[PDB]
Ligand binder design. Structure first.
Ligand code: SAH
Ligand code: SAH
Lengths: 268, 265
């Protein structure tokens, strides 16, 4: 339909069952960092901090790809996501002993503290500026002095790559049992950035060649370096560094993904 | 999942083709039929013999023929696709002669003042059938009669077959979504596009689509080859320009427009 696709309460509800396979493709062809290398970066940062990390929360934990990596390294992990469908996959991966809470950021209905909080593979880009700042504030209240918060965002280069003309760009891939078509549009103001995620899955109990299309609107926000630094300071983080895509290289106007390392200050 | 060449690659596309052409025009530099007709008419007005009877081979759904019909020419069409010709018969009416045949066969029993082929149908012919088609067209024309057609230019093959991984292009249109995958063998003897098409399923609940996949197999005919085959067919002149303009053709051209003139016997 040429008419606009509305924003659903859970844009991942139809994707959760095929998400892990799609991640494999984004890692191969769209520079997304493997969760093992994200974990290596996170652990290296933690090892530079004076307080040891044991309890870890991931917000926007999705199907648990990042949490599963940390579980295998020996951490006591917990997850939060707004999508029941994603969390069902995470439950299968992590087992029944891991706490997984369904909540929509900036709400974090957890009272006990964590030694560290993370968010991998760009979930925080779904938050508008106001809710992003409130999420940083909520994460700060879970951390002790010196505790860390490590997350990624789409970098400036992502927005310039996929929103560079009045005419929308289209990206597609055909995988074994699913075809995806992504159409990227943004308002003239560029206040947010939309992707229509069209997914074609074979229709069960139907003649060969039959597919069911579902469409979901994924609405992204660019959080600039200057805004992230301001909101981190407001939330009570005494330092905030950014690097290019889970490496030690500087973040630049070309970066496709930015990786933020925040340290909680000493004022409660 | 490999796709073979169908006898009619356009059978599943004919019903959606005119709308797809609107998108190619707005995004892939295909020339509107009115501007192709303008170019053709300007070329004809440089010839000493007036043009009235016009045949288009690879006439498809009749978009080019409809433009010339509007201008007053007596038009005829040839295409191998019954599905495409059904659309052409709707646009042009029942009085226009439309013949189903696969080039190089042209089963017609009278000549034309001019022959055309618009929007790159002749790129589906390999070298041998392309040369035989030029020979068949020459035999429809009087001395000095002209043949105007387009081909994919060198820039098209460079743009879509240079990457280390096969290029994928896509769009969602009205009731149909397309994914195109561009591959070529190492020999580069031909150039393939797999046309993966999701078309709404009639009488099914909303969101049901039927996928069909068609192989479109293209050939690059170099300028040297075209001039050689034009000479062999009996054309005395053969000029090439960039995409239906008077600008010269270059290695960067996406579309080449050929203007051939039949020689004297
Ligand atoms: N406001 C919000 N509150 C909670 N979860 C959110 C959210 N906005 C997006 N998400 C979640 O962000 C996730 C992004 S996909 C990333 C999943 C996982 N971290 C991984 O490494 O693969 C989705 O599961 C989505 O449901
Ligand atoms: N060998 C062949 N013989 C006859 N028609 C052919 C052919 N190879 C390709 N075609 C036809 O070439 C057409 C290309 S599409 C172009 C259609 C029309 N000239 C227009 O201006 O839109 C299709 O209709 C296809 O069926």
């Amino acid at each position: 339909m040429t008419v606009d696709v509305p924003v659903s309460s859970d844009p991942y509800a139809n994707l959760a069952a095929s998400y892990d396979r799609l991640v494999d493709w984004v890692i191969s062809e769209q520079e997304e960092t493997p969760r093992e290398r994200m974990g290596d970066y996170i652990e290296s940062f933690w090892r530079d901090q004076p307080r040891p990390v044991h309890k870890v929360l991931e917000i926007c934990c999705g199907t648990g790809l990042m949490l599963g990596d940390l579980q295998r390294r020996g951490y006591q992990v917990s997850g939060l996501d707004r999508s029941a469908a994603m969390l069902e996959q995470a439950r299968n991966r992590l087992g029944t002993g891991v706490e997984l809470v369904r909540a929509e950021l900036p709400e974090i209905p957890l009272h006990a503290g964590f030694d560290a909080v993370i968010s991998a593979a760009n979930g925080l880009t779904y938050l508008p500026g106001t809710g992003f700042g409130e999420t940083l504030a909520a994460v700060a209240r879970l951390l002790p002095p010196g505790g860390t918060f490590v997350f990624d965002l789409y970098g400036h280069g992502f927005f310039e790559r996929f929103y560079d003309s009045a005419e929308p760009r289209v990206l597609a891939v055909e995988l074994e049992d699913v075809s995806y078509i992504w159409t990227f549009t943004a308002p003239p103001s560029r206040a947010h950035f939309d992707v229509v995620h069209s997914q074609f899955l074979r229709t069960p109990d139907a003649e060969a060649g039959t597919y069911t299309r579902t469409r979901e609107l994924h609405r992204f926000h660019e959080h600039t370096h200057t805004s992230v630094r301001r909101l981190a300071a407001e939330a009570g983080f005494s330092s905030a560094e950014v690097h290019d895509n889970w490496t030690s290289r500087p973040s630049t106007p070309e970066s496709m993904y930015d990786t933020w390392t925040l340290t909680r200050g000493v004022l409660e």
